[PDB]
Ligand binder design. Structure first.
Ligand SMILES: [Ca+2]
Ligand SMILES: [Ca+2]
Ligand SMILES: [Zn+2]
Length: 359
């Protein structure tokens, strides 16, 4: 969907409507903690809206925004991101910041998660039809943006004590829940591309396509916010006693001169049993740029590990030329199974072929 960096436009309409939908649908028996956190969320409507548009303006964005796409049908290196994995990453960060009362930052992250959900609920994104593949990509989003006011909805159809919402709370595994919830909306979106929204179809078809995918984006966003309010009100932990199949690193590089690096970068772990795994951190684009925030996903060789089995974690640099760079990370977070399990301020130089321990 379109958005503008000042937190306006289609993306902003979707999250704003998301909150309003939820206010309308919330049943009488909702816990008081949930209503209070909803009030905190509304105190932070600006950041919700800003985060819902920011990813399109992020200087660190991938060149073709590859991670804003996801097809719902289709261990020595890091794994790339998709619209679906970003929803999960930003949701964990949001829950993490919420638990410590950092509500402005939490709500921004929440908004970012919702940017990615909103995208996978377009027709073009879950169909993988880019602006390069089709003139209709931009045309359709502009058509929707111009008409966004007429596609606003103010209820999901049902109160929060009813099926659509209670089904959202049934699965305490947030990540598994989110993936299949998003999957359902993205299949309807991809279906709408082929049935109504592509350049093969008519203006009436586009109108119907916008009506349905915008309604779905708003209803689905309401559901995510609902899940979020329950999660942070109960301190729900979605990772509890689950095998760590993979780790996600979220690394903020300092904005200081020459803080970034082009040297080889590795993330690594050592278990209680003395076993190690190391991966190179190397995303498609230009990693570890001064002031950027990079995301890496690492798949574990051993699929039967609990988080507490991971005793040590480090990052390690290796000079690419005869002149060792220096790299200065501001902070690194490590996420396992939907929970931030390490939040390490660094703010110090890693000079040549040095290792820095993050746990
Ligand atoms: Ca590379
Ligand atoms: Ca670079
Ligand atoms: Zn968008």
């Amino acid at each position: 969907w379109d958005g503008k960096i000042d937190g306006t436009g289609t993306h902003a309409m979707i999250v704003t409507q998301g909150v309003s939908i939820l206010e309308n649908d919330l049943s009488k028996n909702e816990p008081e903690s949930v209503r209070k956190n909803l009030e905190i969320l509304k105190e932070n409507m600006h950041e919700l809206q800003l985060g819902s548009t920011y990813p399109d303006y992020d200087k660190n964005a991938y060149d073709l925004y590859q991670d804003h796409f996801w097809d719902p049908d289709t261990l020595a290196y890091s794994i790339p991101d998709t619209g679906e994995s970003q929803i999960r990453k930003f949701s964990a960060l949001a829950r993490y910041e919420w638990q410590r009362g950092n509500y402005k930052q939490a709500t921004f992250y929440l908004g970012e998660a919702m940017h990615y959900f909103g995208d996978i609920d377009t027709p073009y994104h879950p169909a993988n039809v880019t602006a390069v593949d089709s003139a209709g990509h931009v045309k359709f989003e502009t058509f929707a943006e111009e008409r966004k006011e007429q596609y606003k909805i103010n209820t999901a159809g049902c109160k929060t004590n009813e099926a659509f919402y209670t089904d959202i709370l049934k699965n305490k595994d947030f990540n598994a829940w989110s993936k299949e919830y998003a999957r359902g909306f993205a299949k309807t979106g991809k279906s709408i591309y082929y049935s109504h929204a592509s350049m093969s179809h008519s203006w009436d078809d586009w109108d119907y396509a916008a009506k349905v995918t915008l309604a779905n984006s708003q209803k689905g966003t309401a559901g995510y916010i609902y899940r979020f309010l329950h999660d942070v009100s109960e301190g729900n932990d979605p990772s509890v006693g689950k095998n760590v199949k993979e780790l996600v690193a979220y690394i903020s590089t300092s904005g200081e001169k020459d803080a970034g690096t082009d040297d080889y970068m590795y993330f690594g772990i050592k278990t209680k049993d003395g076993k190690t795994q190391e991966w190179e951190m190397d995303n498609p684009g230009n990693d570890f740029m001064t002031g950027s925030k990079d995301t890496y996903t690492f798949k574990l060789k051993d699929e039967n590990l609990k988080i507490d089995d991971i005793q040590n974690m480090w990052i390690r640099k290796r000079k690419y030329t005869a002149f060792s760079d220096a790299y200065k990370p501001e902070n690194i977070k490590i996420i396992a199974n939907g929970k931030v399990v390490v939040d390490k301020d660094i703010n110090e130089w890693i000079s040549g072929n040095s290792t820095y321990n993050i746990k």
